[PDB]
């Protein structure tokens, strides 16, 4: 059963793109090629994926270990005066602490569960996420 780690309770993780991080039915990859938010999104979508979406501290607890600052899929709409993901879902409360660093309409992820408001035009490393089956 599920209170122990033995070869019998092991399973394959995926499906994910080749040589990606697979965790709790999610796929992730980190790109060290600095790009602005638009190019970062385009890169993720070119690989049938999107920028990091944060939806659960439990399911995505590995985000606590990430060094440095990376584009995630969070964008500001000035009309509603609120943050939301690429896929148009709302930022759930008590997930991210959002910190005004630069005046901008995009956010960089940093551990633990922070978003730093950054100029969309500024080159940064980025994280792609794909949800499995």
């Amino acid at each position: 059963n599920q209170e122990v780690q033995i070869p019998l309770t092991e399973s394959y993780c995926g499906p994910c793109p080749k040589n990606w991080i697979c965790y709790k039915n999610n796929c992730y990859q980190f790109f060290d090629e600095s790009k602005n938010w638009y190019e970062s999104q385009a890169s993720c979508m070119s690989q049938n994926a999107s920028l990091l979406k944060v939806y659960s501290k439990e399911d995505q607890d590995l985000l606590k270990l990430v060094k440095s600052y990376h584009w995630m899929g969070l964008v500001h709409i000035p009309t509603n005066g609120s943050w939301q993901w690429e896929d148009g879902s709302i930022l759930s409360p008590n997930l991210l602490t959002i910190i005004e660093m630069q005046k901008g309409d995009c956010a960089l992820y940093a551990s633990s569960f922070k978003g730093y408001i950054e100029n969309c035009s500024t080159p940064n490393t980025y994280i792609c996420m794909q949800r499995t089956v």
Partner: protein, 261 residues
Amino acid sequence: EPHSLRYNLTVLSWDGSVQSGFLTEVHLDGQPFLRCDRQKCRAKTWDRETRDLTGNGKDLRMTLAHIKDQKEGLHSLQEIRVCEIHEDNSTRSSHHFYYDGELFLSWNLETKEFTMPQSSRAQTLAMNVRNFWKEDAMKTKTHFHAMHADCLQELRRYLKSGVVLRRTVPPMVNVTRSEASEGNITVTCRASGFYPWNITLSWRQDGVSLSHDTQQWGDVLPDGNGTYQTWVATRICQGEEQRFTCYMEHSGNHSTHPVPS
């Protein structure tokens, strides 16, 4: 004067061995607020403070390990960060590194650039440290900016939640006579229990401020209650006490105080 938040982080080495312990002093509007170690923060629960400041403590232990250091016994490395919010809602920043109690490196938000003192032992320490941060991309421009942005969010969070260890307290004023000798008297004007520190206190003859040199001046002393006290005295002829008033400015309050009787 501005709202401020200061984080004073110290790590220690004994004979090149970096100790497990570190400590962060947090000061809010100049007042001791939190002391934090690896386990816990304590005021004079604090869970979000312990997470943040344990992170910086570990980075600073690693930083002290990369310092090449022939001299044996005790050495200390400090990272001291302050953010300020002013009247006009403009903000200030400083970010300094001290080794054995001496500055060797600052980071400047406006320019996004390191500054070093002129000393050559300052320049050696600074390059030990900068080269370490560069090899591993450990402390980038962005990390320095983010630490400053968190400093401002936390200060705002403390202010929004009414942890505001600051309010005006106007002075109590008392005028007394003394040293009644050879048809002269000392007149003394005392301001006590006052906050903030800044005050104007002056004797006047017929409403004209006497020179500094014809007056005697208390220092501005802490009460032990969070407030201040001071005084000014002057030497006049008996019979002339009507012509002498104590003038005081504190916190937009301009008042005048005669010699009693």
